[PDB]
């Protein structure tokens, strides 16, 4: 019993983290087979970042200008290309610790684990989500660029996120592993501002299902609603619109607890309009939206890897 | 920038988790060198747990009654003893993945990472703390007994916690790695009730320091206080008494932000008496007490392992 913000075990990913230096700049890379992936801005000065021209900055560089360090030992770079906003450095050795893996582009509302790294060494693991405005609310100091977000299915690690930028807001932006940013962000130091951070409604409903499974039941109400009425009240609180696919995804949680999905929405409606009245739900005083419906099923049943 | 509940990378500990079976019961063990550690209740039936006599239950068992499985392959048990509430099974192979390690008994207020496991396989990693009443608020289903809590210092893993019991409250209890429970709990299914869960005051102050470092500054006040006055108000809210050693431990955070420790207490005093007024601090609406002062320093500076 009990419910915690839980991240995947990071062992499979620890053994893929390297340090990449290009002259004055150092960040982290992902070494999978004989390729090392890292943010293309490794090749910039701090001055270069107000208006960099990456194709021109790259002509100065040769295979040997990139120093890749895997723990203690150096890897030899034999080839380098730029793909969108990531650099792919071809090394001579395949990583002996390469797990089974996939590159996936996730969608807003999905969650993943971040292995935070500095100079190729893992510092910590935490769970976060792709906000609807395509930022993530992470924990990233300078030198952490190149840390990756991942999901593990049994034996296969699905890489979905590489860290690249911190917005002046203190929130973060990055790419998938083919180098395309999530959302409208770019790897330049300019006036980029994130949009409205709305709350991920399906995830909140998932987390309320987790609550009644685990004891907290005071918020269960005597009301029901419809999707259209609920969504009226959800727009006023900057909550994602709830859709019929979200309803289906919550079916298994609905089935396990005997609480129809629309009844739980009516419970959620009243928490938005009346507040928490100083009470708690799973030890929080605000509504948590960083568990997906699959996270709840997994943690409440014992799924391993 | 940003601040997250962060757990240590679990790689060093993943490679030590095994499955232990004793007839009908299966749980997890910790394989360090040529010893496997696990809760002694592996040897009980479900009926045995209302009133077990462990020394008598153990006479029935022989070296070969314990089945230890390390991923796929079986380990051969050549010796077994009971130490307080843990069993130590002597196997013929040393673990080739044994890291540098220590057994430590932590004190209330200290934090650590849990690697949750079922049938010897890691399911997830999260951070928690030893509450002042000597429980932990974990995430543990049946079969998770034997999961361990640990802290990593650079290369050395300090093991501090093994999971054993879930109280009827839904909170959890366990032992250090020499088998002694934290607090007054026992490995029997009886009416054991946890005491008042007080809030860890030094940890809250640490987390407010983390806030001003990261932007949230609305709660900074115009007042100061003294230890005795603050502790008067802390007792009424079931907050641990703040001591002069706690003041010293917070010195480095005091030095970095220019905010004297007692000024931050006066800020905390007003949050207890006036509430949050619907505002947030680092994205929470209640005060968080599961970061120690050393956690804050570490996450805000980039300490790796
Ligand atoms: Cl909260």
CA A303 vs. chain centroid, Å, equals 20
C-alpha distances (whole Å) from B150 to each of A90, B5, B40, B263 are 37, 15, 20, 34
Query: Per-residue DSSP letters for B106-143?
Result: --TT-EEEEEEEETTEEEEEEEEE--TTS-B-----TT
Nearest Cα residue in chain A from B128: A4
Using CA atoms, how far residue B187 sits from A249, B57, B182, in Å, is 40, 14, 12
| Domains of chain B: residue spans and CATH | 11-175 (2.40.10.10), 201-301 (1.10.1840.10)
How far apart are the C-alpha atoms of B157 and B300, rounded to whole Å? 21
Q: How were these coordinates obtained?
A: X-ray
Is A170–B2 a contact, with Cβ atoms under 8 angstroms apart? yes
Q: Which two structure tokens, joined as six digits, stand for B213?
A: 């470092």
Tokens standing for residue B272: 């207890």
- Check CB contact under 8 Å for A9 and B8: no
For the annotated catalytic residues of B, the residue numbers are 41, 145
All residues at 6 or more sequence positions from B105 whose CB lies less than 8 Å from its CB, including other chains: B160, B176, B178, B180
CB contact under 8 A, B302 and A118: yes
Q: Among partner residues A115, A124, A140, which is closest to B2 by beta-carbon distance?
A: A140
A122: contact with B, CB 8 A cutoff: yes
DSSP A146-163: T-EEEEEETTEEEEEEEE
Eight-state DSSP code of residue A120: T
Ligand 1 centroid to B237 CA: how many Å? 17
Q: Is A80 a catalytic residue?
A: no
A210 in Cβ contact with A291 (< 8 Å)? yes
Written as one string, the DSSP assignment of A69-100 is EETTEEEPEEEEEEETTEEEEEESS--TTPPE
CA A253 from centroid of its chain's CA atoms: 24
Q: Give residue A108 CA to ligand 1 midpoint distance, Å.
A: 22
Q: Do A126 and B7 touch (CB under 8 A)?
A: yes
Token digits for B18? 């095994």
Tell me the nearest-neighbour CA distance from B9 into chain A, angstroms.
Answer: 5
Q: CA-CA distances (angstroms) from residue B26 to B19, B118, B120, B125?
A: 7, 9, 9, 21
Helix (H, G, I), strand (E, B) or coil at A102: strand
Which residue in the set A2, A8, A286 is minimally distant from B140, CB to CB? A2
Phi and psi dihedrals of A105, rounded to 5?
-95, 115
Q: Which helix or strand (DSSP H or E) is residue A289 part of?
A: none
Which residues, in sequence order, are CB contacts of A222 under 8 Å at separation 6+? none
Helices (H), chain A: 11-14, 54-59, 201-213, 227-236, 244-249, 251-257, 261-274, 293-301
* Shortest CA distance from A128: residue in chain B: B4
Q: Which of B7, B122, B170 sits opposite A304 (nearest CB)?
A: B122
What resolution does the deposited structure have, in angstroms? 1.9
Task: Tell me the β-bridge partners of B128.
Answer: B112
* CB A250, CB A263: distance < 8 Å: no
Give me B303's structure tokens: 């300490």
Check CB contact under 8 Å for B6 and A117: no
């Amino acid at each position: 019993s009990g419910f915690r913000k839980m991240a995947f075990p990071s062992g499979k990913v620890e053994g893929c983290m390297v340090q990449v230096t290009c002259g004055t700049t150092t960040l982290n890379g992902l070494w999978l087979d004989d390729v090392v992936y890292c943010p293309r801005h490794v090749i910039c000065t701090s001055e270069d970042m107000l208006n960099p021209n990456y194709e021109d900055l790259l002509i100065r560089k040769s295979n040997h200008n990139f120093l890749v360090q895997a723990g203690n030992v150096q890897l030899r770079v034999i080839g380098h290309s730029m793909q969108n906003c990531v650099l792919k450095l071809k090394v001579d050795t395949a990583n002996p610790k390469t797990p089974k893996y996939k590159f996936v582009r996730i969608q807003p509302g999905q969650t993943f684990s971040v292995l935070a790294c500095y100079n190729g060494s893992p510092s910590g693991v935490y769970q976060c989500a792709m906000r609807p405005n395509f930022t993530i609310k992470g924990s990233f100091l300078n030198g952490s660029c190149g840390s990756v977000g991942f999901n593990i299915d049994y034996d296969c690690v699905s890489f979905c996120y590489m860290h690249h930028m911190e917005l002046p807001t203190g929130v973060h932006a990055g790419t998938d592993l083919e180098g395309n940013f999530y959302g409208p962000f770019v790897d330049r130091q300019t006036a980029q501002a994130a949009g409205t951070d709305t709350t991920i409604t399906v995830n909140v409903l998932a987390w309320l299902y987790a609550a009644v499974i685990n004891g907290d039941r005071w918020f269960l109400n005597r009301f029901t609603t419809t999707l259209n009425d609920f969504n009226l009240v959800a727009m006023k609180y900057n909550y994602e619109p709830l859709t019929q696919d979200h309803v289906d995804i919550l079916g298994p949680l609905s089935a396990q607890t005997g609480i129809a999905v629309l009844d739980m929405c009516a419970s959620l409606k009243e928490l938005l309009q009346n507040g928490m009245n100083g009470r708690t739900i799973l030890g929080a005083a605000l509504l948590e939206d960083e568990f997906t419906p699959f996270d709840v099923v997994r943690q409440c049943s014992g799924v391993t890897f």
